[PDB]
Design a binder for this molecule. Structure first.
Ligand SMILES: Cc1cc2nc3c(=O)[nH]c(=O)nc-3n(C[C@H](O)[C@H](O)[C@H](O)COP(=O)(O)O)c2cc1C
Ligand code: SF4
Ligand code: SF4
Ligand code: SF4
Ligand code: FES
Ligand code: FES
Ligand SMILES: [Zn+2]
Lengths: 22, 80, 87, 263, 426, 83, 106, 47, 210
């Protein structure tokens, strides 16, 4: 079970971790 | 895009009257040297033909495409 | 594709050399087409001499003149190219 | 310096590093049959009609897109590079609609000639052909696009020479059709050049639809007076009335292009 | 030879049975020497790859070490990148679906272990969009890892900074191609580029880039941990290591099991997986590497074994090592026919030889299944096949030609009879 | 008058040609004769018009009748077909 | 048979005529179809080679059976589209039979 | 023609004619193309 | 591949990312390198589909604006890939895998079962628009050969009956246990593990020094 936005929203959550942009 | 018709020099006589024909509407010409285009391999030889035959000449220098640098990689450039 | 026998391109080629050797004062180029036809080329002054040798030589009797023609290459300084075909 | 030596059939031409294999053949004088490669348009490699055979190499290379390398011998007329053209031309023609007596790029076809010169004499496509719905791209260009060989020179010109960036490829497979997804006319100056640049007669000129056929047209080289760039142009006249004005190349002024107004 | 030990297997979490999440992974001890390895440096890691002898593991098995090495050249001011293709499109491949779904972490540390080997700034994982649920699993895993600090700035205690991203595929087999994965990542249409500007040289976003099958990225951390030798020992000569084998179709227990590469084929189906449905005698043909590779008929098969060198001797490719088996109960003419239908519905159409050629073979193949076409047409398709094989911009046209070539090569009499059958009833 | 509206002006003298003679024209005009033939309602997206009679007709061409609004017309016969 | 003239003005009948006899100029008809505004065979120029019969893709121009068309005035011999189309309508039945008999050979 | 009648195509003539050359029905050749260079007609309104 | 404007499917249908969706779009853009927003076309376009299954021409236009990319580009991506609907699609949108691997394990039966089960022919959708049947190609999950993708879920290793059961579950109620509805766990040897029978290994095992 997962929602249609799981991939995107999870990613947004990961944005904070995401290292600085180029 | 073929370039096999841009190889040999040609000298062409000046264009003249092409009046419509009344009975059938076909084009009609009074100039005999119209359809004549002689082909000469080099500029020097063509100039010679004009001088000995006495026709006036105005040579146009050949203009060939300049070299152009192309490389498939460029189209994927970080910043173009 | 047409059938080509190299027997002729060899025979004719040799003859070409023979003519050239015998008439070196006038023969400029002697070629055999891919169609097995020889075409000695002579300086205009060699018209009389080269023909006569071919009309009256035991190893090359060329008795009849098939044709005399003149292509006109306007580009060429010497405009006309008199061509004599012999049999 | 900066002069590699590459052999085109053993002619040791020397070219600046960066020259493509097609370009190397040009300086010797040989001309790789080509579609989708235009000098002033980016290399795309779509047609693969230019496959040549560098010596001692397993596969044939794409002329228009392969940086030449030192030593290579091009073997342009190698038995192989002829099967590599006898078999491509098999494909371009297979899905092609044979309406050559409709296609007003009759004698102005880089696909019949490259077929009459570099391709086979027959066909083996016993299967059925395809058809692509036409498009009213505009009032100047008639796109009978069932003719298109998906060579993407339009999509390039319409993006690179002119900044329209409208024409694009839509879909995949054998029904990739290179037409505007929504029907928006290609309205821009420099528009008519697409006609001249599409080697196929898919999209051609609508005013000069069927008034003539190129062998007849007597071609007189003259100057553009509509605008002050003075673009060089060739006026194609038949029996004494002008039938078409198409560009003729001037490196400095109009390099193979002319305005929508002056044609 | 074969018979790899479970102990010496790489993805113990295969078949699940262990938490695909981090905890289970910690008991697996997948993140054990990651800081140390990266501390070793890019060169050492790439070296281990060479010693490993690890080939592609994806489609064409290029030596991994040398390939990755191509981007170990000094940066020219453009950030280098890592792209890990997880398209897993080759028909018959569920090989990758496992690592991604079952053991997401192995791939996460595969990414950073691999990353410092190429000095990649960041890695993008293109999981096919079809697998939405699969994506859900990996970024949960990726999220865990950063929370831990295993990835990101200060990666696992290393000054190395690496960021891992997941990109949505959109149902295209061609997206899988190395130059085309990039363009999808770039956001244009998924159309391959020509190789002359090689992928390392022109990267994604014009920044040097490298592409690896997810299996290839996943094994690199464990191979560094176990050392190239341990790994290189399992395989045969050039062909080395143990490659996961997915057997699907006409086998008693279809399953993906990793076994010593160079494992005999008659044995693969015999020992793991399950017996050929209907007895080994009921084996019309098998396609060893998936749809792209040519199928091999039964007499050739047991003789040959599954390693890339042995297969190329056999005229077939190890490829994704997806074993598809066809009993004597199948119309091969129609089996291969749908694979050509698989390729007409999928090739990008960028190149003339694939666009019309693959459609042309599809039309002829459909007639061949009916038997409407005459016998002379069969070698005609031979000739159409090689025109497509050497002229295509990418390898898919390479791939479309091979199954056609296999059907004519070993099953030419059967197609002639289908030819004959229709002619008789008129 | 003729197929193309070729009608010598009231003042043109080529009309002298027609003096005491018949200006040859054909009552049967194609622009109209094709119209009469009805649109063929084929049931396949793409159909082919060999021209009628195969070798005794016109070069074979395939027409895309996909556009629901309009009808395909063979560049040769002028025959129209709709899906 | 419908009534649409066969010629689609590809104009290669003009290209291959040895004597320069056929003169064709065309424009897109209102229907949008391709058709010849003027098709003039100068029969005095024509040497009746029969290549035009050969060249036409739609086989619109045919060598008709009649040989008796001697005319009092030179102008009558020049033929425009209307005379040829009328000639076509008059002899269509026999032309169709003749082409029917010889097409397998061609 | 009686035995195998020909094909009728709803344009073919029903009354075929002989040489009409001396009779007024004769072809008189004429160009069927329309005008090509239309001219600027002068304004009829006095300026 | 031509969008002939229709009252339903044409820009009169206004499209705009819900405030939340726009937030999502921003993150998507962050992943890609700055100055390369265009790369987020596929992800963003998908989000649009998530919002509206139809993904109308208007949506495509919005995507373009949001990513400041030429409109045509969005069109190319949409018309190239297949996971984008470009039309209205059924609530369930089942897709049946029919590549040779599945077919060899009798995929055709499943499709036939669905056709009448659904009462709708492939390429078509039910009247209630609840189910749209499409013959899609290899969806991965080949090992569990008989397999179909209902919406996002992957129902695998299904015998004809199983689907009917699943469809009913979908028809009344929701979330019908998506996954392989057979005893096999994932892609294990159906009968018994041929390997990986023993417990997994431990950290540091057979590790070369450093
Ligand atoms: C049509 C086509 C489809 C492909 N699909 C895949 C795929 O799904 N997964 C994959 O890893 N490689 C695929 N490849 C191969 C890749 O292009 C590339 O060679 C490979 O991913 C490199 O990884 P490796 O270095 O680990 O072998 C495909 C190639 C082609 C031509
Ligand atoms: S393009 Fe027009 S002319 Fe060239 S081949 Fe196709 S149809 Fe004949
Ligand atoms: S239109 Fe002309 S140019 Fe544009 S693709 Fe089709 S053929 Fe190439
Ligand atoms: S007559 Fe035949 S060939 Fe001459 S134009 Fe009309 S159609 Fe083309
Ligand atoms: S010109 Fe070489 S690819 Fe088209
Ligand atoms: S073929 Fe249906 S799962 Fe790959
Ligand atoms: Zn027709």
């Amino acid at each position: 079970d997962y929602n249609t936005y799981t991939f995107l929203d999870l990613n947004l959550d990961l944005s904070k971790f995401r290292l600085p942009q180029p | 895009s073929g370039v096999n018709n841009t190889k040999k020099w040609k000298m062409e006589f000046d264009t003249r009257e092409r009046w419509e024909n009344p009975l059938m509407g076909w084009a009609s010409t009074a100039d005999p040297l119209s359809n004549m285009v002689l082909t000469f391999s080099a500029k020097e030889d063509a100039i010679a033909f004009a001088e000995k035959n006495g026709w006036s000449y105005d040579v146009e220098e050949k203009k060939v495409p300049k070299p152009k640098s192309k490389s498939y990689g460029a189209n994927f450039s970080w910043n173009k | 594709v047409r059938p080509r026998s190299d027997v002729t391109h060899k025979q004719l080629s040799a003859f070409g050399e023979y003519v050239a050797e015998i008439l070196p004062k006038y023969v400029q180029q002697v070629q055999v087409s891919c169609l097995d036809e020889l075409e000695i080329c002579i300086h205009p002054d060699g018209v009389i001499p080269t023909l006569t040798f071919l009309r009256d030589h035991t190893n090359a009797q060329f008795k009849s003149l098939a044709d005399l023609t003149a292509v006109d290459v306007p580009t060429r300084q010497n405009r006309f190219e008199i061509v004599y075909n012999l049999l | 310096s900066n002069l590699i030596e590459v052999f085109v059939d053993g002619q040791s031409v020397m070219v600046e590093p960066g020259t493509t294999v097609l370009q190397a053949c040009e300086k010797v004088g040989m001309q790789i049959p080509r579609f989708c490669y235009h000098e002033r348009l980016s290399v795309a490699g779509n047609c693969r009609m230019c496959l040549v055979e560098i010596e001692k190499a397993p596969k044939v290379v794409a002329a228009c897109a392969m940086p030449v390398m030192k030593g290579w011998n091009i073997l342009t007329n190698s038995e192989k590079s002829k099967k590599a053209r006898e078999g491509v031309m098999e494909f371009l023609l297979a899905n092609h609609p044979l309406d050559c007596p409709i296609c007003d790029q009759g004698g102005e076809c880089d696909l019949q000639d490259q077929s009459m010169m570099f391709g086979s004499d027959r066909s083996r496509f016993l299967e059925g052909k395809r058809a692509v719905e036409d498009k009213n791209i505009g009032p100047l260009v008639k796109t009978i696009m069932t003719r298109c060989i998906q060579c993407t020179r339009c999509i390039r010109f319409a993006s690179e020479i002119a900044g329209v960036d409208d024409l694009g490829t839509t879909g995949r497979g054998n029904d990739m059709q290179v037409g505007t997804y929504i029907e928006k006319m290609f309205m821009s100056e420099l528009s008519g050049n697409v006609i001249d640049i599409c080697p196929v007669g898919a999209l051609t000129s609508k005013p000069y639809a069927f008034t003539a056929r190129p062998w007849e047209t007597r071609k007189t080289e003259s100057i553009d007076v509509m605008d002050a760039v003075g673009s060089n142009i060739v006026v194609s006249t038949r029996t004494g009335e002008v039938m078409r004005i198409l560009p003729r190349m001037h490196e400095d002024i109009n390099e193979e292009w002319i305005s929508d107004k002056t044609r | 030879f074969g018979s790899l030990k479970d102990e010496d297997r790489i993805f113990t979490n295969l078949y699940g049975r262990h938490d695909w999440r981090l905890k289970g992974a910690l008991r697996r001890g997948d993140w054990y020497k990651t800081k140390e390895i990266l501390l070793k440096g890019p060169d050492w890691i790439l070296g281990e790859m060479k010693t490993s002898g690890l080939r592609g593991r994806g489609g064409a098995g290029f030596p991994t070490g040398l390939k990755w090495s191509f981007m170990n050249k000094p940066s020219d001011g453009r950030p280098k990148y890592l792209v890990v293709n997880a398209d897993e499109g080759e028909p018959g491949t569920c090989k990758d679906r496992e690592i991604m779904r079952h053991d997401p972490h192995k791939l996460v540390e595969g990414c950073l272990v691999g990353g410092r080997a190429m000095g990649a700034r960041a890695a993008y994982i293109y999981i096919r969009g079809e697998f939405y649920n699969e994506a859900s699993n990996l970024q949960v895993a990726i999220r865990e890892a950063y929370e831990a600090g295993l990835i990101g700035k200060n990666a696992c205690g290393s000054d190395y900074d690496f960021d891992v991203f997941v990109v949505r595929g959109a149902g295209a087999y061609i997206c899988g191609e190395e130059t085309a994965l990039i363009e999808s990542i770039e956001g244009k249409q998924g159309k391959p580029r020509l190789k002359p500007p090689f992928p390392a040289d022109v990267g994604v976003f014009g920044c040097p880039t490298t592409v690896a099958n997810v299996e290839t990225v996943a094994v690199s951390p464990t191979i560094c941990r176990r050392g190239g030798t341990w790994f290189a020992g399992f395989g045969r000569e050039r062909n080395s290591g143990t490659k996961l084998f997915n057997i699907s179709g006409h086998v008693n227990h279809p399953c993906t099991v990793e076994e010593e590469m160079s494992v005999p084929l008659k044995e693969l189906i015999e020992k793991h997986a399950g017996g050929v449905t209907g007895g080994w005698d009921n084996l019309l043909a098998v396609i060893p590497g998936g749809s792209s590779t040519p199928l091999i008929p039964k007499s050739v098969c047991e003789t040959v074994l599954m390693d890339f060198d042995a297969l190329v001797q056999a005229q077939t490719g190890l490829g994704t090592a997806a074993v598809i088996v066809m009993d004597r109960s199948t119309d091969i003419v129609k089996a291969i026919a749908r694979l050509i239908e698989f390729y007409k519905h999928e090739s990008c159409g960028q190149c003339t030889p694939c666009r019309e050629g693959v459609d042309w073979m599809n039309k002829v193949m459909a007639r061949f299944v009916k038997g409407d076409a005459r016998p002379a047409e069969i070698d005609s398709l031979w000739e159409i096949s090689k025109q497509i094989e050497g002229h295509t911009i990418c390898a898919l046209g390479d791939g479309a030609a091979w199954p056609v070539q296999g059907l004519i090569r070993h099953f030419r009499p059967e197609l002639e009879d289908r030819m004959q059958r229709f002619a008789q009833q008129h | 008058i003729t197929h193309t509206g070729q009608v010598y002006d009231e003042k043109d003298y080529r009309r002298v040609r027609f003096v005491d003679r018949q200006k040859e024209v054909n009552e049967n005009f194609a622009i109209d004769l094709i119209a009469q033939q009805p649109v063929n309602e084929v049931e396949h997206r793409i159909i082919a018009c060999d021209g009628g009679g195969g070798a005794l007709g016109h070069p074979k061409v395939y027409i895309n009748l996909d556009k629901e609004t309009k009808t395909g017309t063979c560049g040769y016969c002028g025959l129209q077909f709709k899906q | 048979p419908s009534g649409e003239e066969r010629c689609i003005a590809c104009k290669l009948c003009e290209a291959i005529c040895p004597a320069q006899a056929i003169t064709i100029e065309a424009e897109p008809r209102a229907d949008g179809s391709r058709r010849t505004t003027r098709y003039d065979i100068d029969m005095t120029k024509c040497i009746y080679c029969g290549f035009c019969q050969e060249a036409c893709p739609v086989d619109a121009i045919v060598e008709g059976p009649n040989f008796e068309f001697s005319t009092e005035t030179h102008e009558e011999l020049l033929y425009n589209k209307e005379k040829l189309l009328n000639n076509g309508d008059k002899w269509e039945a026999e032309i169709a039979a003749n082409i029917q008999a010889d097409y397998l050979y061609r | 023609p009686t035995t195998n009648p020909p094909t009728a195509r709803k344009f073919i003539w029903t009354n075929h004619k002989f040489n009409v050359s001396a009779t007024p029905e004769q072809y008189v050749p004429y160009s069927t193309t329309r005008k090509k260079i239309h001219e600027w007609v002068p304004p009829s309104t006095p300026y | 591949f031509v969008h002939r404007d229709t009252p339903e499917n044409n820009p009169d249908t206004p499209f705009d990312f819900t405030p939340e969706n726009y937030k999502r779009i921003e993150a998507i853009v962050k992943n890609y390198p700055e100055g390369h927003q265009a790369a987020a076309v596929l992800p963003v376009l998908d989000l649009a589909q998530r919002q509206n299954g139809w993904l109308p021409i208007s949506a495509m236009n919005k995507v373009a604006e949001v990513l400041q990319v030429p409109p045509m580009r969005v069109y190319e991506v949409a018309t190239f890939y297949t996971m984008y609907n470009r039309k209205p699609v059924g609530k369930y949108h089942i897709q049946v895998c029919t590549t040779t691997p599945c077919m060899l394990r009798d995929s055709d039966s499943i499709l036939e079962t669905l056709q009448r089960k659904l009462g709708i022919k492939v390429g078509e959708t039910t009247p209630d628009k609840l189910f749209t049947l499409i013959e899609v190609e290899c969806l991965g999950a080949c090992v569990n050969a008989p397999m179909v993708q209902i919406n996002d879920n992957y129902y695998e290793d299904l015998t004809p009956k199983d689907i009917e059961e699943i469809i009913d579950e979908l028809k009344a109620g929701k979330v019908p246990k998506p996954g392989p509805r057979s005893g096999r766990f994932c892609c294990e040897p159906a009968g018994g593990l041929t390997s990986l029978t023993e417990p997994p290994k431990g950290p540091g095992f057979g590790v070369q020094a450093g």
